[PDB]
Amino acid sequence: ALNSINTNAGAMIALQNLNGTNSELTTVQQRINTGKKIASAKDNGAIWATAKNQ
Amino acid sequence: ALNSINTNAGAMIALQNLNGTNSELTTVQQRINTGKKIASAKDNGAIWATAKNQ
Known part of the structure; x- marks a missing residue:
C-alpha cells in the first residue's frame, strides 16, 4: 500500500x-x-563419468 | 415550543x-x-477469510 508497516x-x-x-x-x-x-558429479554427469572411466 | 423546560x-x-x-x-x-x-471478521468477511486461507 506504499506505506505498509507489516x-x-x-x-x-x-x-x-x-x-x-x-x-x-x-x-x-x-x-x-x-x-x-567438472570436479564432481553435480557439475556434469556425462562428462564426469567419461573422464573417470578414461 | 421554543421555550419548553422539559x-x-x-x-x-x-x-x-x-x-x-x-x-x-x-x-x-x-x-x-x-x-x-481488514484486521477482524467485522471489517470485511470475504477479504478476511481469503487472507486467512492464503
Whole structure:
C-alpha cells in the first residue's frame, strides 16, 4: 500500500538477488579451488563419468 | 415550543453527532493500532477469510 508497516517487497527482492550472487560466487570459488570445471558429479554427469572411466 | 423546560432537541442532536464522531475515531484508532484495514471478521468477511486461507 506504499506505506505498509507489516511488509515490504523491496527487502525480499534484494535478498533474492543477493542469494543468487552468493550462489554464483560459490560456483566460481569451487572452480578456483579444484582447478577444473567438472570436479564432481553435480557439475556434469556425462562428462564426469567419461573422464573417470578414461 | 421554543421555550419548553422539559425537553430540547438541540442537545439530543448534538449528542448523536458526537457519538458518530466517536465511532469514526474508534475505527481510525483500530487501523493505526493493528496497521491494517481488514484486521477482524467485522471489517470485511470475504477479504478476511481469503487472507486467512492464503
